[PDB]
Amino acid sequence: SLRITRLTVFHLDLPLAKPYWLSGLKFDRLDSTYLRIDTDEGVTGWGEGCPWGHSYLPAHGPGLRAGIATLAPHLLGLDPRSLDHVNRVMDLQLPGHSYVKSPIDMACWDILGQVAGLPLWQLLGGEAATPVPINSSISTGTPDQMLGLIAEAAAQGYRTHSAKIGGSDPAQDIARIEAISAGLPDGHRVTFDVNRAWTPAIAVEVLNSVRARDWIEQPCQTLDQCAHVARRVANPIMLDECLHEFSDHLAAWSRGACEGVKIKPNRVGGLTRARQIRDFGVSVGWQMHIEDVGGTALADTAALHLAASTPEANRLASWLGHAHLADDPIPGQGARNRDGLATPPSAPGLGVIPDPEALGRPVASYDE
Amino acid sequence: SLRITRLTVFHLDLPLAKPFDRLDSTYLRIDTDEGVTGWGEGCPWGHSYLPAHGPGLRAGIATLAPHLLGLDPRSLDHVNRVMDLQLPGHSYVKSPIDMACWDILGQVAGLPLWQLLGGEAATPVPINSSISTGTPDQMLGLIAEAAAQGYRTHSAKIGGSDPAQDIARIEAISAGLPDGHRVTFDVNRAWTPAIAVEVLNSVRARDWIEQPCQTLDQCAHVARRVANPIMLDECLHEFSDHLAAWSRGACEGVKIKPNRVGGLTRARQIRDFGVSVGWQMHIEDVGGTALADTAALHLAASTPEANRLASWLGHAHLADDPIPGQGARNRDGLATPPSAPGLGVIPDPEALGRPVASYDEGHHHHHH
Amino acid sequence: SLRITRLTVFHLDLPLAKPFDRLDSTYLRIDTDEGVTGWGEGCPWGHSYLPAHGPGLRAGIATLAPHLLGLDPRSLDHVNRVMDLQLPGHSYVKSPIDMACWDILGQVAGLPLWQLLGGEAATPVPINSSISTGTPDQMLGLIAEAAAQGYRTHSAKIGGSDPAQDIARIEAISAGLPDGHRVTFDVNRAWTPAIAVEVLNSVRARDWIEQPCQTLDQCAHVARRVANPIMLDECLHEFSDHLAAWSRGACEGVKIKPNRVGGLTRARQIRDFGVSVGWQMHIEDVGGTALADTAALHLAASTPEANRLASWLGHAHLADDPIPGQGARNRDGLATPPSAPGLGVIPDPEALGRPVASYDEGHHHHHH
């Protein structure tokens, strides 16, 4: 009886606070898509898809909007409360393209929350709007630079740190790892994030040279390569970018490839798909970072609802995308960082409402 | 801010239509502070079928009651976590509690359960018959009678220590089906691997065989050696058993029963897993009234059609009805779940009788 | 020192002969500074068949265009590496780009593509028919018609939720073939493992079964349990999927489609792997005009005869032809690739219409 009536697509140019200079490109800004879903009864949901550029994952801004175009005729007329059904239709009408699917799913969850009068964290089964620890991002440099950046991060109140390492020089990674692990303040945690920059050979060489037993995030490009490394080294392994769908998680589990995963809605295709993965992780005793790939506090809030509803023993720190942006299109809205922690809203649905006058003029609109 | 205020336990002596001649059923009413009230049923098929019995169910509620009081029943995963913390195992105890909390959530949301479980419609679900064991043409008599009733799937009970009569049963039934109709051979753990191998490799029929043997290991052994699709049921008590079954490659379908697996929250995760791996599923409860039948039918109706087989209605086997004209009933071999908010069945406490237990919150200045 | 100078994108609305009633095809012209010009086609079979759609293809070219400009198109592996760096996945986008660079390389070398892919001759390749689903003798009518045309291999479309009609289809078609002729049963992911096991073990026919199920895991399960050769297709998106299929022992053949795998450079590696492990292969594209058909036929013709099965020509299903009298065409159920340098098909831009996009190199002192 409830029925999707209009889909409206907006495009946001979001400059980064720290641009960086790629070898192939000055990586300057993010191409975010906001999606508004209107229904016949005046309940309206919002979703965000914002890929981390077009080189990070199988995802890009222009493809996201092109994907919505293709899906739009089929989403019109659906009951947005029947969430698994909406996902089935999307998967029927456009296979893959999980980055297209995530803001559509997110906006339907928003509608369902408003209709039920429940915040997303409660629909996802959580007892409370649990404050979720936020991790810092420590850029690559010397031993002394990164450890100075860590002391800076600790002063802002971060207690979990993502130290960015990697490159095909093993000896400087060894010196980075051993300095950072030995020079942490008390109670603080590091993850060493390699972001696929190692081959199995380099991974085996550095990790077997090192006394540190901290988390290693996604050392290699593929699951096969990562599972190879895991058999040969002594560190906990966190997987992330190689995990595109549920069957990849099933594969990671049966190989014994990891002790933790990151879950990111824009990688896996929304909150419906991300919740199934979360629940699987709980069942098998994974520890999990739950965040999105990038963009505004809109996407950040969606994933933090999943993070907060996740049991304490399985939940690790979240990352907030909007902390790295220089602009804010939804000021004072959604889940924000105060003293190293972020709390999701308890308002029905997603609890963040964009003003369309802050967003510019719609790039596309679809109705029937 | 919604809270559980009272738990009330009812016990129902239900005579069977075809006489072990009666069932011990437990009804559970859960009251809240805002006057929304949920119902659940747990009814083991005797005490000898599963790790489950009537007296144990009420002792389990007794054990769990102090911990359920004061919980938010909309927070369904949290409620399941507390129950698992406070009484490990005992999934037959937890099934009615989780059922009644789903009921509350649906009423609070204004949504029927099949929609909360993601389905697009109150889909009419095919019902299967139970054909009791006899001679070939005794059972072939009973199938024609069931076909006359409007059953299009049939569950024929076979098994024994004697291979020759089970061969004659299978080949007669399978060749002498009416057109369009399906038969499942339910052996119900009666075979050893040896007999299963001899029977199934002497037989031209390639119909479903439901749980040939006692254990997962034994069933996986049979499956490697025979040509039939294998359906698993009684050996699967939690999600990890389903994971083990998939990794062994032991089956191509599972039966999902809320009283075996610990309720609807646990059954849904299993269902979603089964859809992911391409299982076909019978979704039904273990026994009892149309209350437990309806809860399972909401899950069945919300399942994709490619993965959904016929349901079994327990109440069809009873002489008594405590909830007349209510819930999901057989209409020409189909059953449609209700589309009222929540479960869509409300017992009258006058039809049930006097409560065997009641559990309440108490004042701090109270004196006897 | 050869450089890409311009990329021009054309969009072609192609009506189907038998009406979903049209195809969205993309033609791509790549110009160089030395005046040698290459063409590619990418045409997904609707948007619902693979992770692939028309609008996404052009958005993908848009994303990739700045990075392709100024590359040497003779350096084919390098071109594929840049594309993989700049847009991960999206193999349907990359297929026309790689195709057009092969075209350039062939013209530059003075060699037809089948020779650059190592083949001794423009070998005439057997073509297979498509037999749409019906009754047994409907499909047996359509096979006799295809036999009259000169088809000696037939791809009969089967599948459904109903085992009994698929059994009757298979046994009639397989027994009622004309002598010398081959049938492949293409189910196209329509079966669950349960139905696949029941159907294939009820059937005397030992013909090819093409992709019974949705996933690699599900197909590997069926193969362990049945007697037919299994052909894999839609589940294989990159080289690592083919490696996984071989290590699982899931199949005895694969279909290779350039639009699924990311073009000719990726298809060749797969082809060479398949020859090494003793696979038999159908080599064809996903759909579209004789442009994409010809590119696939160059690969098919260069394949050893022991490993090569029949090709399918997409253009045979279209009402329109944008490139008349050109490329590889059916002659009595055989097709010979051209022996002109490169691809051996040059579109006229006047027959296509006005370009939907164009991308160019720009001067540094330029002002609007």
Please give a structural write-up:
This is part of a larger assembly, with 3 copies of chain A (368 residues). Chain A folds into 2 domains: 1-117 and 356-368, Enolase-like, N-terminal domain (Enolase-like, domain 1); 118-355, Enolase-like C-terminal domain (TIM Barrel, Alpha-Beta Barrel). In chain A, helix 8 (223-230) links the parallel strand 8 (215-217) and strand 9 (237-239). Helix content of chain A is 36%, strand content 20%. The first copy, chain A, has 12 helices and 13 strands. The relative contact order of chain A is 0.16. The first copy, chain A, has a 7-stranded parallel sheet with strand order 5-6-7-8-9-10-11. Chain A has a 4-stranded antiparallel sheet with strand order 3-2-1-13. The two termini of chain A are 16 Å apart. In chain A, helix 1 (61-75) crosses helix 2. By secondary structure, the first copy, chain A, is of the alpha/beta class. Chain A binds chain B through residues 79, 81-85, 87-88, 115-118, 122, 124-127, 246-247, 250, 254, 272, 276, 279-280, 283-284, 309, 311, and chain B through 72, 74-78, 80-81, 108-111, 115, 117-120, 239-240, 243, 247, 265, 269, 272-273, 276-277, 302, 304.
Quick synopsis:
Chain A: Its cofactor is Mg(2+). The structure is cut from a larger assembly and holds three copies of chain A (368 residues). The first copy, chain A, is an alpha/beta fold and 368 residues long.
